[PDB]
A paper describes a structure:
When responding to complement activation, CD46 binds the complement activation fragments C3b and C4b, which have been deposited on the host cell. CD46 then facilitates the cleavage and inactivation of these complement activation fragments by acting as a cofactor for serine protease factor 1.
The STP region which is situated between the SCR and the transmembrane domain was not present in these protein constructs. The putative BVDV binding site was located in SCR1 and encompassed two peptides, E66-V69 and G82-L87. When mapped to the structure, these peptides were found on the C and D beta strands and D’D loop and formed a single binding site due to the antiparallel beta strand configuration. The area of interaction with BVDV was identified as two peptides on SCR1, as seen in both bovCD46 structures; these form a single interaction interface. Comparing this region with the same region in the human structure revealed a shift in the DD’ loop.
Author numbering:
A (entry chain A), B (entry chain B): 41 to 169
Write the structure that this text describes.
Amino acid sequence: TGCDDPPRFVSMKPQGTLKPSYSPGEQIVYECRLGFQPVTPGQVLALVCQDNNTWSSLQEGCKKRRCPTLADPTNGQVILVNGSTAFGSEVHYVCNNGYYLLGTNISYCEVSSGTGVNWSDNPPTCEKI
Amino acid sequence: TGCDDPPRFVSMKPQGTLKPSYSPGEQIVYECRLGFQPVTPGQVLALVCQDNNTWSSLQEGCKKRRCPTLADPTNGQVILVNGSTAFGSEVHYVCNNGYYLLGTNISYCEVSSGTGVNWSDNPPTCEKI
Ligand SMILES: *[C@@H]1O[C@H](CO)[C@@H](O[C@@H]2O[C@H](CO)[C@@H](O[C@@H]3O[C@H](CO)[C@@H](O)[C@H](O)[C@@H]3O)[C@H](O)[C@H]2NC(C)=O)[C@H](O)[C@H]1NC(C)=O
Ligand SMILES: *[C@@H]1O[C@H](CO)[C@@H](O[C@@H]2O[C@H](CO)[C@@H](O)[C@H](O)[C@H]2NC(C)=O)[C@H](O)[C@H]1NC(C)=O
Ligand SMILES: *[C@@H]1O[C@H](CO)[C@@H](O[C@@H]2O[C@H](CO)[C@@H](O)[C@H](O)[C@H]2NC(C)=O)[C@H](O)[C@H]1NC(C)=O
Ligand SMILES: *[C@@H]1O[C@H](CO)[C@@H](O)[C@H](O)[C@H]1NC(C)=O
Ligand SMILES: [Cl-]
Ligand SMILES: [Cl-]
């Protein structure tokens, strides 16, 4: 009879398109989601439909990427409102009294190319008034 | 003779309605599309039919707005399937085993007001079974 629905993972997704049923011996190859990277590069991540008609056990193979850390602009400050620079986080820029924020005040950690995250915007500056 | 077809832009559209033909000296003012915002606010964006009957050079002036970042619901997870919270992306909500999803499982980053994007739905929760 075989294996039906593959489990959903935190950090991975099926590499290709899933079919309705799987028979013993067939495998689904997984790959990191957007914004995640391999825990151990080169490691092949796969589920196998087994003879006892179960899905085999697959350890989570990927981890959330991080954007580069960010310095305070001169005469102002960057706030890691989400507690980190992990993918899917944002940062808030503010300026000190007497200064005016020139540029973007919120920046987002996003996928830049297939491999890599980056901040959506450059840092602003704090200009004197 | 004059200038005929103004180029269509990635991030901008003409502010008003276009006429069949333009003469040298006339200008078409551009504005951000729905779901975009100025790259450098204040900067006036316009094409001008020049005297050499060409359209002037206009850099792309706007950039895709972003929706606010999203936290994983307790006992579950939000998946930025498109790699960002940019206008016109979606996120998927999933719950851990033992938990069911109470609410909407897909949220879309949409235009909310003239200036503004927001998610189409509030986050669901994950409740025990
Ligand atoms: C954001 O990511 C979502 C999820 O991956 C994208 O939507 C998905 O788009 C794929 C195509 O890339 C759709 O696949 C299609 O499946 C149908 C049958 O399901 C098939 O007839 C087609 O030939 C095609 O293979 C998929 O259904 C769709 N999934 C969902 C949940 O909407 C979306 O395109 C991405 N958005 C942006 C802005 O990049
Ligand atoms: C289905 O068969 C597989 C064997 O291919 C079982 O996996 C093994 O299970 C034992 C006991 O749980 C472990 O000590 C081994 O390390 C497992 N091997 C592998 C490769 O995973 C699996 O438990 C079986 N499942 C059911 C429901 O019968
Ligand atoms: C990162 O932190 C921001 C700021 O606290 C979170 O965005 C706020 O979320 C609250 C609800 O928790 C909303 O009421 C606000 O509208 C959001 N603020 C802004 C400026 O949009 C965001 O959810 C957090 N992101 C992650 C990934 O945890
Ligand atoms: C047209 O004239 C402008 C100067 O107003 C010049 O910058 C542009 O390169 C010219 N282009 C052509 C095709 O003649
Ligand atoms: Cl810091
Ligand atoms: Cl996240």
